[PDB]
Design a protein around this ligand. Structure first.
Ligand SMILES: Nc1ccn([C@H]2C[C@H](O)[C@@H](COP(=O)(O)OP(=O)(O)OP(=O)(O)O)O2)c(=O)n1
Length: 129
């Protein structure tokens, strides 16, 4: 449906999900997301996501299966989540205001960025198996 894709990672470790608090732009700063970024020319979804998580968080991940449905952000961009597994590193907020590990009991009530909120059921399911 669009020409531009934004990939995001659902990193689950020890039964909790990594969420990242945006610091920009103003309209999203303070709200929580699955970290990731735009797929750039030449990149696969996995290349782009692993690169974004290395840049933003300082971690190495393996990119797994899609999580949940694609989301239309606007007329130009589609947002897609993938499950990812931590291979090496501890996440650090290089670009984000804060990081947090959340369990199933926290997913629904988190101050999500609006687009990511459609993934709530999928994230809760992922944390429960
Ligand atoms: N889990 C996420 C990740 C991103 N987005 C939205 C926010 C932006 O509208 C768009 C692009 O996200 P980026 O984090 O890549 O924003 P940038 O604009 O910083 O990308 P770049 O600066 O590389 O152009 O996707 C979102 O709704 N949910």
């Amino acid at each position: 449906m669009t020409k531009q894709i934004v990939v995001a990672g659902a990193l689950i470790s020890r039964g909790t999900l990594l969420v990242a608090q945006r610091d920009r732009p103003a309209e999203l700063a303070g709200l929580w997301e699955l970290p990731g970024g735009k797929v750039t020319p030449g990149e696969s979804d996995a290349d782009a996501l692993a690169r974004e998580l290395r840049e933003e968080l300082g971690v190495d991940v393996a990119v797994g299966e899609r999580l949940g449905a694609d989301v239309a952000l606007n007329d130009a961009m589609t947002l897609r989540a993938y499950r990812v597994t931590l291979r090496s590193g501890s996440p650090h907020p290089h670009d984000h205001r804060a990081l947090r590990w959340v369990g199933a009991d926290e997913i629904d009530g988190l101050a999500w960025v609006p687009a990511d909120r459609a993934w709530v059921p999928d994230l809760v399911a992922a944390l429960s198996g």
